[PDB]
């Protein structure tokens, strides 16, 4: 009944409506700080000189944006990768002009999200579960690290991190393609397959289980009332589902082990999104998508264009226009 | 060729700005989320139904019993995320619903683009930016990107039109 | 910003009309139980 032991029992209690835990001790303050600053900035922050060229970009609602165009703007290119907390600025006005809020938000968020992953391990341990849900979450978490931390590190500037906004995200995407040809990179191709395939299998599994629900209600009520929370018996006939799907393709292309099936459902999108996070993370070091520009030439040496060369034309257009005032020299090396 | 189709749709239709595509994005990424989170949850709330360290062997397709604990899965997610599924039927229907609905929404948006009925612009942004050369958003930044794409890919991408764009008319920022 | 004026009425009814429908259905369910 010691005072520290009583605190410890409350932090790790499985009776709290929301589990706190030791990871939560860090997660709760960092997420609140990031959230509060983000909301305030999104509504009211003044324009930010993201590219360090004294050309401020207006990101907030009160400065003429709507929900789709608004953003918390990345910090000034003049700052690069330098740490820029509030107490390094001569004034909040300076700190706002240079994009200080973006740094505060992304650092608090990445910390709080990392602790979110730890919290998933921790409660699983307090409830006597198996531990690997947090491993599923490492795929979206790694993706957030890639566009908020890793890519700025390799390019030398948080000004090239992804903006906290909807149109800013598309800006990040378009510029990424012009400089890395991400579409032609196999790890992004694997990410598409993980995301397309994940949507596919989500719909498959949902439709197969729904298709084989055991009749338990009348036509005047939701079939959902045929399941009661915590009932011991399964609510659908997996052998009927297997019998349908195995005939739709062929027998051995259909699961009849539910554990194997759900593991497959877990693994496919998780691994696909690991690869696409790794794609951003390695294009951060400028190992770019396949280049087949002028790869086909004829007997004389005329270039014979392919669809890759058409892609390059579009990429060139994005290259020459992006940050139209920020380049003084012919090569955009970062 | 499909990659070229994506980029065409950015530069000419401003398709990323279209709310029907955004609803499709949410359905595809929401579906992939649901797929991963559901698979992982089942696999980490399994009942111990055998002694082997490989837990796959401890399932039998004709068993009546649920192979994982809905009650423990619900408690976990309620305490982790605030809310959780409690109805196995709703959950699997929702997994049908989310990606199917998303794809249907994107199809509606492409039907609009058949007619060049784009959500290309916000009129209020354009009126302000035309009058006020210090007003800049990520929205105006992206349209400049779209204009580069069009002028630079169109001659080779639409060869039947015989577009000849002399160097001096091509939009370009400084140096690049 | 020179926004469409009817945007406000359109937005308000878009929220209000279907939300009110759901609230009506929910409250009369509760008074059955």
């Amino acid at each position: 009944a010691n005072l520290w032991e009583r605190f410890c029992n409350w932090v790790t209690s499985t009776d709290n409506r929301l589990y706190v835990g030791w990871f939560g001790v860090i997660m709760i303050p960092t997420l609140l700080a990031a959230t509060i600053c983000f909301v305030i900035a999104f509504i009211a922050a003044p324009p930010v000189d993201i590219d360090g060229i004294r050309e401020p970009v207006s990101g907030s609602l009160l400065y003429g944006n709507n929900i789709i165009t608004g953003a918390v703007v990345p910090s000034s290119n003049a700052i690069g990768l330098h740490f820029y907390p509030i107490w390094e600025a001569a004034s909040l006005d300076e700190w706002l002009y240079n994009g200080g809020p973006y740094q505060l938000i992304i650092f608090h968020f990445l910390l709080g999200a990392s602790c979110y992953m730890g919290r998933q391990w921790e409660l699983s341990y307090r409830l006597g579960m198996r531990p690997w849900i947090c491993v599923a979450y490492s795929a979206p978490l790694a993706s957030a690290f890639a566009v908020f931390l890793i890519y700025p590190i390799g390019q030398g500037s948080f000004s090239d991190g992804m903006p906290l906004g909807i149109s800013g995200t598309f800006n990040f995407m378009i510029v990424f393609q012009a400089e890395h040809n991400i579409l032609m990179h196999p790890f992004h191709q694997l990410g598409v397959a993980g995301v397309f395939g994940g949507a596919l299998f989500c719909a498959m599994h949902g439709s197969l289980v729904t298709s084989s629900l055991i009749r338990e209600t009348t036509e005047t009520e939701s079939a959902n009332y045929g399941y009661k929370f915590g009932q011991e018996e399964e609510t659908y006939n997996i052998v009927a589902a297997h019998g349908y799907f195995g005939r739709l393709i062929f027998q051995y292309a259909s699961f009849n082990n539910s554990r194997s099936l759900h593991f497959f459902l877990a693994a496919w999108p998780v691994v696909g999104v690991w690869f696409t996070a790794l794609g951003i993370s390695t294009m951060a070091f400028n190992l770019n998508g396949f280049n087949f520009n002028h790869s086909v030439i004829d007997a004389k040496g005329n270039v014979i264009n392919t669809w890759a060369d058409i892609i390059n034309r579009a990429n060139l257009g994005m290259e020459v226009m992006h940050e139209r005032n920020a380049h003084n020299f012919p090569l955009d090396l970062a | 060729a499909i990659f070229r189709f994506l980029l065409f749709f950015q530069g000419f239709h401003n398709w990323t700005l279209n709310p029907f595509h955004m609803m499709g994005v949410a359905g595809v990424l929401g579906g992939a989320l649901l797929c991963a989170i559901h698979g992982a949850t089942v696999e980490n709330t399994l009942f111990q139904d055998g002694e082997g360290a490989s837990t796959f062997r401890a399932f039998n397709p004709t068993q009546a019993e649920e192979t994982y604990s809905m009650v423990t899965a619900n408690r976990f997610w309620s305490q982790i995320f605030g809310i959780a599924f409690s109805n196995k039927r709703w959950l699997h229907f929702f997994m049908l619903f989310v990606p199917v609905t998303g794809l249907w929404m994107s199809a509606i948006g492409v039907v609009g683009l058949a007619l060049n009925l784009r959500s290309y612009d916000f009129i209020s942004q354009e009126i302000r930016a035309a009058e006020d050369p210090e007003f800049e958003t990520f929205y105006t930044k992206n349209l400049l990107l779209n204009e580069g794409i069009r002028a630079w890919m169109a001659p080779q991408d639409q060869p039947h039109e015989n577009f000849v764009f002399p160097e001096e008319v091509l939009p370009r920022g400084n140096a690049l | 910003m020179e926004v469409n004026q009817l945007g406000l009425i359109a937005t308000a009814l878009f929220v209000l009309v279907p939300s009110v429908f759901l609230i009506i259905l929910y409250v009369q369910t509760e008074s059955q139980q």
Partner: peptide, 30 residues
């Protein structure tokens, strides 16, 4: 009026979060 509208809708969603978590219908076993 459009800033007010965006913020209003956003605030309603946060309030809905609160009720959906703390005033959910409690899951009851079997």
């Amino acid at each position: 009026m459009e800033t007010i509208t965006y913020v209003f809708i956003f605030a309603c969603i946060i309030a809905l979060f609160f009720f959906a978590i703390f005033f959910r219908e409690p899951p009851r076993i079997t």
